[PDB]
Amino acid sequence: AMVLSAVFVPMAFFGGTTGAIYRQFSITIVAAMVLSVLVAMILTPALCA
Amino acid sequence: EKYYFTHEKDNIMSVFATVGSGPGGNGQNVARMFIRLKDWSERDSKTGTSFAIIERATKAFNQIKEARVIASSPPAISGLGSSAGFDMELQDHAGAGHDALMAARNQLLALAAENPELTRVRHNGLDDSPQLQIDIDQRKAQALGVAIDDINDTLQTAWGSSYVNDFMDRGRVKKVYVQAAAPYRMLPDDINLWYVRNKDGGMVPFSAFATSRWETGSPRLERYNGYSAVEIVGEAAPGVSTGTAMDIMESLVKQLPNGFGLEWTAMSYQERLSGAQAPALYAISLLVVFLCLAALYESWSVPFSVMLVVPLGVIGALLATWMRGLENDVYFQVGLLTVIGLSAKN
Amino acid sequence: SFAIIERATKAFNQIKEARVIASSPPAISGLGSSAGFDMELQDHAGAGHD
Amino acid sequence: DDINDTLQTAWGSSYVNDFMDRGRVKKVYVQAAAPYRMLPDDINLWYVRN
Amino acid sequence: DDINDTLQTAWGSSYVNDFMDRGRVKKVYVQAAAPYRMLPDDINLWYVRN
Amino acid sequence: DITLRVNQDGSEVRLGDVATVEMGAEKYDYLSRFNGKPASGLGVKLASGANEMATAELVLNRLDELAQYFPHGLEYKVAYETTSFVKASIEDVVKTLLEAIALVFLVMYLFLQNFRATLIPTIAVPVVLMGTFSVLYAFGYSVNTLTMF
Amino acid sequence: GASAQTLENTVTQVIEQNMTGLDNLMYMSSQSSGTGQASVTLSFKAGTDPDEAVQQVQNQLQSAMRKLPQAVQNQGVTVRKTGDTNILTIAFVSTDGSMDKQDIADYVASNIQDPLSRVNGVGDIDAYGSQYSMRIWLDPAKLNSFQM
Amino acid sequence: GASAQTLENTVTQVIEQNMTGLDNLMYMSSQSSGTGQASVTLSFKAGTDPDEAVQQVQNQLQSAMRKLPQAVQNQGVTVRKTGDTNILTIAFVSTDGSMDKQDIADYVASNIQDPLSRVNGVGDIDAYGSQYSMRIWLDPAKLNSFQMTAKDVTDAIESQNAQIAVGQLGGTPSVDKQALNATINAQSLLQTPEQFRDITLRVNQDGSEVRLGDVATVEMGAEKYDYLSRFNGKPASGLGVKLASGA
Amino acid sequence: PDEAVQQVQNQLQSAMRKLPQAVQNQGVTVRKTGDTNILTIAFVSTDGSM
Ligand SMILES: CN[C@@H]1[C@@H](O)[C@@H](O[C@@H]2[C@@H](O)[C@H](O[C@H]3O[C@H](CN)CC[C@H]3N)[C@@H](N)C[C@H]2N)OC[C@]1(C)O
């Protein structure tokens, strides 16, 4: 998750219209990755157990 | 409309034509037609796509020689521009004049038509037109006792429209206009049909003190920033990048006489601003990934083992993009970053 | 205030020259009677005032 | 009104209308010549029409 | 136009100018005197110059 | 019947004696047709910094309401609308998202060979997606082609 | 009834000279048409608050409104935070043919254009047909006949 | 036409009345002049959004707009965010000497002031020169000689130097099979001083013509003669660039 | 409320020149209704001189 978010975090900083487009993807994917961390360490262990 | 309802009647849901309104400015000689296609399912998706329809339509319209009819697709972004393709303003910095500006516009259009790298280069405006000039001999006018204000008033009220006041029609206060009847304002000789009143109350014809003379003028004058300019929209040929086409247009405007410069506007302006931040992004992202790997594995060697698989995904993504004939764009870049991330995880 | 306005309403209903009502001020002008309703009977066809 | 207009135009520049100058629209001002608006007695030099 | 003016500035008010009263600028209103704009017959009391 | 001059003879010169009066358009510049039929059009322009889809939905709804009082035979027909493409594209992206979830479920069932085991990663998808939508709302972003992709 | 040159001299140039000090002004494009319409499109940098931009433009413009010709003032200048692309173009057609083009345009401009222009989000709604107006067509022969 | 004391009592004080109590207001400073121009300068606390302050001032203005005299309302009241930060003061000087100070001022005000005023961050550009203007210098002796008045010259100029909206040939609605549609230009704005000298004030019955030059000295001069700037002892013109707040 | 009143004022500026001159002279005010009146002070002349 850290490397996945690392490939996308710098993308958001870029400005301009292109930066805005990047920011959209960046925010979305980084949030998805963080939640996947939280889900994989909270919900999935309980389900497996 | 006959063409659209005859040749392609399996893709057109409806057409709506508005005579008098145009993308390059309103006028009696322009018309804008809104064509609405059917759903994507009903269309062929191989020959009924918007692009194929536009291609066939533009061939049939280039066959038309009575007017300049141009079929264009709506812009990629709603706010930026009115149609796809590069957008350029051809200003007149030196203030040479309107005639010099129009001559330079024609010269630039000819130069663009010379280069096959640029397609549909055109002026998004109205060409110069002959316009009548009514010159009144002031001395002869007031020698007959006719006030200049009176002749100006009758001229502007008769030929032009005069909004006197309002009247109420079924609950709404609509305007009241006074103007000459249509048959009496169609020809230059119709000026002589009007009689003004002198001091003594006698009626004098307009032919007594007024003459008419034809002259060239512009029905629409556009000014980009503070300088007179002519907007020159167009399209880029397949293969050559839009930035390269813009540079070609810059070369063309350089070939123009001195005093005329260009300023990209709207989508072209924003495209010129951006597009060079990719390599930086990639480099910074790769450096960040390497540092994160070094932190995770507590080594400066293991990340090199991991970071060598980025090309293994990049080559495949590039091969897939080129094989399908796609283009390196914003979507492609984000894809590349996703591929890099997944290769890193693997 | 309520008893005063009640007596005033009685005495003013006794008045026949004009219509006079004594009412306590609402706390907020926006709020009205919970059972009330405001309707604007419009004239879409432009029929006329009459 | 004539007296006030004459005074205003003579001593204060009266912005009548505009004129064209090399593609720029510029103002037209009407005012008395410099030597005729310098002393308090210069007011007596002007004539209004009966 | 004369008829409409006489009606408007006689029966209705007419805010013509401002006057300085004790260091403050008030309004100047021109209107008919009260007894001359009280009845429909008072219309006939007005004269218009041809 | 507007009187221009009453002669001493008593013969008046009315407006109709010197001109023709009729009720026409105030501006004669436009002349529009719809499918070869006479028509009149309106071009609604979005206010800068406003949602296009919501504005178009509000406009059309209002038009419907107004349509109630239309004279007999008058009908409005949307000739050029942009939000239709946006809605269709978003629907298509939702379709491919659901199809992707189904295919991922199929692949995981194939590899794991246990329905009970397969269900565990599948449930993780809606939770993460809903959390992502919550984050998008918190950050003030909007459902668009980029976010959906 | 104005000319392109007349508009570009008396209106378009006058407005441009006063459009000064606007924040985040990327570029301004103005056009003066012979149809009698003059426009000045001030496009601001992205992220600028449209309301603040409109406030600044209106504040600057109000100084120059008295300079404009009398007819322009009577017609009135409008400042809208609108683009050029139409989000939707509605077409009104009389199915029965009872109402001609002018009747349809008048009904639209009377009962439909105003309520739509007040819908939230609608920056501007131009019309491809104008409302009714008491058109008076002068006959110069008759005007000279009666010495008027 | 208002004296300084009258202007202060009737305009400035009224404007100051309601604006006291504005949020984040530090102090006010009126500068009622003697030519009839009022100026109230409100200073807000540091960190206040200039735009929001201007909006609040404009909103509070309509509360006291009715109390102002009719003439003041007709002239109009303007609210602008004024600063005093002079980023640059560029002085324009003609090294050759071919250009008079008025020529330099005209060139600056026509070609330089406007493009620089659009630059981002430039709140205002004070001009130390004025563009050209067709100065009509009246001569009272000559006016009395020809039985003319100043208003005669003004009306003649305002009538013979006007831009007229005449219309178009074949403008809609038009007769069927109309062949051509063209704009009809008319009497245009004059351009050279000699054109103004030829403006005919009055044609006598004998055919004698009283031209404008006969009663006036037409000459192209400065719109505002007030300013006079010198750079290193030489005639020059200048622009004072004023920074927009928050740039 | 400030934004709303500012927008209303801006829209009105495009119409005040179409209003009758009398209305313009009287002035057109844009106000936000709903203000709270803390006090209503009444001034009375006990002596009757005023
Ligand atoms: C959208 N709500 C409104 C809106 O008008 C808002 O506008 C601010 C705008 O004033 C700020 O702009 C600010 O920009 C610089 C500050 N460093 C200086 C000028 C200042 N106006 C923008 N950065 C953010 C907008 N939402 O300001 C007031 C408000 C009530 O919050």
Numbering used by the authors:
A (entry chain C): 446 to 494
B (entry chain C): 594 to 939
C (entry chain A): 643 to 692
D (entry chain B), E (entry chain A): 742 to 791
F (entry chain C): 248 to 396
G (entry chain C): 51 to 198
H (entry chain B): 51 to 297
I (entry chain A): 100 to 149
Copy text verbatim from the article accompanying this structure deposition:
Within the HAE-RND class of membrane proteins, AcrD is distinct in that it is a specific aminoglycoside efflux pump that mediates resistance to a variety of aminoglycoside drugs, including amikacin, gentamicin, neomycin, kanamycin, and tobramycin. The AcrD efflux pump is a substrate/proton antiporter. It works in conjunction with the AcrA periplasmic membrane fusion protein and the TolC outer membrane channel to eliminate aminoglycosides and minimize the toxicity of these drugs.
The structure of trimeric AcrD bound with Gen (AcrD-Gen) is very similar to that of trimeric AcrD in its unbound form (apo-AcrD), as they both present as asymmetric trimers. Superimposition of these two trimers give rise to an r.m.s.d. of 0.4 Å, suggesting that the structures of these two trimers are very similar to each other. A closer inspection of the trimeric structure indicates that the trimer contains a “binding” protomer (open periplasmic cleft), an “extrusion” protomer (closed periplasmic cleft) and a “resting” protomer (closed periplasmic cleft). Unexpectedly, an extra density was found at the ceiling of the central cavity formed by the AcrD trimer. The shape of this density is compatible with a Gen molecule, indicating that Gen is bound by AcrD at this location. A tunnel is formed at the periplasmic domain of the “extrusion” protomer, which binds Gen at the central cavity via hydrogen bonds.
